[PDB]
RNA sequence: GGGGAUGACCCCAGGCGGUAGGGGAGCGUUCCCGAUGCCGAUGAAGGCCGACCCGCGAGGCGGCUGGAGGUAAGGGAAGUG
RNA sequence: GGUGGAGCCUGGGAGUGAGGGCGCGAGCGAUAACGUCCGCGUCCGAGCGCGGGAACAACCGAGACCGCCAGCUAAGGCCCC
RNA sequence: CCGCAAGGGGUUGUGGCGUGCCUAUUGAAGCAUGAGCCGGCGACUCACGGUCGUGGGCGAGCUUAAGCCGUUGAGGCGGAGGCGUAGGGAAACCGAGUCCGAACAGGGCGCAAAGUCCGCGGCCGUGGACCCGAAACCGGG
RNA sequence: GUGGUUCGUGGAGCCAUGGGGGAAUCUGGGCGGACCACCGCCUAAGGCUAAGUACUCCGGGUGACCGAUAGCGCACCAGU
RNA sequence: CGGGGGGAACCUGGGGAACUGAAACAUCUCAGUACCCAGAGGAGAGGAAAGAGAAAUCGACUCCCUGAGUAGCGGCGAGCG
């Protein structure tokens, strides 16, 4: 069912529980009231929701799942790239 | 604990828990492998001589049976291919956890820096009076930024440095003399 | 190096990290069938087994 | 499908547009223009399905 | 399987014909280490013969040969039987 | 369930993908063939290597880990070789 | 005859029992093949892929091309990248949900069980790739 | 009507041309893959340009390369 | 005045193939491969843009790794890429 060549867009999977976590460990910068965008595991930072939205921190980032952004409510503040 | 500063009677300093740790020797073999192992060079047989002339593989219905394998001096068969890639690339992380483990082996002798500046082999001569042995036989040289000079030609040369100096440097069984600085590898590990 | 053929990766051919996979159902229509419906409720996924093997394999590296 | 014109040709309906059709083979046999049978479109529910085609 | 000290020993169970073929484990072969390894003109090797070792592929060893080597107690390597 | 020891799933490495021989139940076939065709048991597999029926895979007994100067039996035999 | 003596050495008269060896075969002394003798050559390997096993280094793990360092000549530094970190779809895109569909019925998944690099290894793909073995087609002469 | 290109006649372009038509010199003219509008890009239809990769007759080194049936077939009145 | 005649292999251009794989074979692959040719060199190749790509960004040509065995070409079959 594949084209006739190329072209392709983007965007890509980064995630809740996952940015906690991991992030914890981001703490080494940006995760204070964090201001998100890593470079440390992805590439086009989309968060996936599930695990439950923590540390209070702002992303710089694409968007986030359904739950995703809303625990994110719960927890935090969102912040989307260059125009959203 | 006992890392014993040259200079003899002059002080004492300390092992690292780097070096402390407990061994591993697979790993070890594996660093050893490593380096003769990139090492190596390569061989083969005659390309030409093995699949150059003509061969008139004298039909049939004749009383025989037929450039190809197995009658002489040609052919080889399966050959020392200067064609086959003689390297072996251990891997960084694996490698220099190697020299890692294999010098706390080492541990199991502390160069005071000064010496960085002693002129003359004959020097050394007297170093050695200064602390001889079988292991001493062993001597291994090294200094730590830029060699030791003279130091590193005598019955027994080489001069690793502070940085650049490996297993395959020492850690084969040998025993020996890292200047400071060479701590400064420490630093490295 | 390496391929596929390509070709069964693309008709019918995908891989569920369980290690298995698909490819569509295909047990008739889209070529003659004049046919039926209820049968036409014939065309969600089709999971062959075992030979899901040469074709795993051929296809491995990407898919 | 097997293109027999013979009495056997292949035909379908619509929905008075309910949209697209449905199935159906049939023969000159009997009957010929006519053809009325009742159906569903994705178009709401039901419809007047002429069958001709 | 019943303890095993590392062996090993003991009981019984318990078989143990075997090609394609699948699994374990050893042997000598010319090479790279001489992992705080070197024998030899009173012989290196290969040869020539043998009623101690091994299940064995081999060992050792003693005798005579012949002129110069080369072994490696251990791992690595393969144009190996 | 007396059994004891095969049983099941997951995965790597396989071979052969054409045998025939016998008894029995069918075909076919002159109920002909050390014919063939399927079937039910075994057989044989270049070693299912010993016994025998002369000799004879291969049909009756029989499972061959290894013990020359032991003993009980198979089937099969015991006037002689 | 006793250079390892009351036991073996060599040779054999007799007597017992006994069909070679290798290929390929339903089946083999073979009368089917193979091979007249002795000595040396001689045939499942390498490379890159991938694969499963495992020895082992961190779980996020890991290395290019290079630059520099080099009796021995010492490795070190390079962080485009690429394999795990959810995936469901054709896609839009959503997303631990996800497609079909407009229905709460199923398929894929979630469920961490987590890889990952390197080492040696049974294997597979491309390689002349267990070894020799023909007719023949084509190119220039 | 052919070529290169990853393009096997294809939705199929760019450059290169075989054969016929045969433009415009800056609001010129191709370009961003049919095409159309707007944008973005370049300025052809002349020439030279050391160095960064290949190669081995020849010289050097070095080899877990060879030992005369192995090495190039030829270690020496051998491509004879 | 310059040429030509060389030259193992390397370069570019002129011309430019069957086997073999597709388990046939007409597409195709083997390849722009082998070969033959002309010619420059010590290296030729090529080489400052009617480019690239699109983040309003990049700026010789070449060669390594990487990009991708991706994007994709296709009796969408071997494969090629």
Redesign the pocket.
């Known amino acids: ?9 983007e ?6 529980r ?1 940015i906690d976590e ?1 992030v914890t460990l981001l703490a080494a910068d940006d995760v204070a009231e964090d201001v998100r965008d890593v470079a440390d ?3 086009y930072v ?1 968060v ?4 439950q939205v923590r540390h209070e921190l702002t992303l710089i980032a694409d ?6 952004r809303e625990k994110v409510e719960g927890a935090g503040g969102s912040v989307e790239l260059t125009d959203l | 604990m006992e890392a014993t500063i040259y200079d003899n009677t002059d002080g004492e300093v300390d092992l690292p828990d780097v070096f402390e740790t407990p061994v ?4 070890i ?2 660093a050893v ?1 490593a ?12 390309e ?3 699949l ?1 002339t003509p ?1 008139e ?1 004298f ?2 219905g004749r009383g025989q ?2 450039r ?3 009658a ?10 200067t ?3 003689r ?11 190697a ?1 890692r483990s294999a010098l706390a082996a080492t541990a199991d002798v502390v160069v005071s820096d000064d010496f960085e500046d002693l002129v003359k082999t004959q020097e050394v001569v007297s170093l050695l009076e200064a602390l001889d042995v ?2 001493d ?2 001597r291994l040289f090294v200094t730590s930024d830029e060699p030791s000079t003279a130091a ?1 030609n005598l019955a027994g ?5 502070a ?4 297993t ?2 020492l850690a ?2 040998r ?1 020996t003399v890292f200047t400071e600085s060479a701590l400064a590898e420490v630093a ?1 590990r | ?11 019918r051919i ?1 891989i ?5 996979v ?1 490819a569509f159902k295909s047990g008739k229509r889209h070529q003659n069938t004049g046919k039926s419906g209820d049968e036409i409720r014939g065309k ?2 089709g ?1 062959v087994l075992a030979k899901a093997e040469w074709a795993r ?1 051929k296809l ?3 898919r | 499908a097997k293109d027999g014109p013979r009495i056997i040709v292949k035909m379908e309906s619509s929905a008075g547009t309910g949209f697209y059709y449905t199935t159906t083979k049939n023969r000159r046999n009997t009957q010929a223009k006519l053809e009325l049978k009742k159906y569903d479109p ?1 178009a709401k529910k039901h419809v007047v399905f002429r069958e001709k085609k």
């Not at chain 1, 996936?48 to 695990?51: D, I, S, T, V, Y």
């Not at chain 2, 380096?35 to 005659?46: E, L, P, T």
């Not at chain 2, 940085?163 to 490996?166: A, G, H, I, P, T």
């Not at chain 3, 190096?1 to 008709?11: C, E, F, G, L």
């Open positions: 069912f594949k084209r006739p060549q190329k072209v392709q867009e965007a890509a999977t980064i995630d809740v996952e991991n595991d992805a590439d989309k996936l929701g599930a695990g968007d986030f799942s359904e739950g995703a | 591993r020797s697979d790993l073999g594996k492998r380096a003769q192992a990139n090492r190596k060079q390569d061989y083969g047989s005659d030409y001589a093995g150059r061969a593989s039909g049939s049976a037929h190809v394998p197995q002489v001096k040609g052919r080889s068969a399966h050959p020392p291919k064609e086959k890639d390297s072996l690339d251990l891997n960084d992380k694996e490698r220099q956890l020299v079988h292991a036989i062993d590193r040369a080489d001069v690793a440095t940085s650049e100096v490996n395959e440097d084969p069984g025993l490295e | 190096p390496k391929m596929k053929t390509h070709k069964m990766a693309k008709r995908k569920t990290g369980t290690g298995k698909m969600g996924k999971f394999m491995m590296l990407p | 994705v």
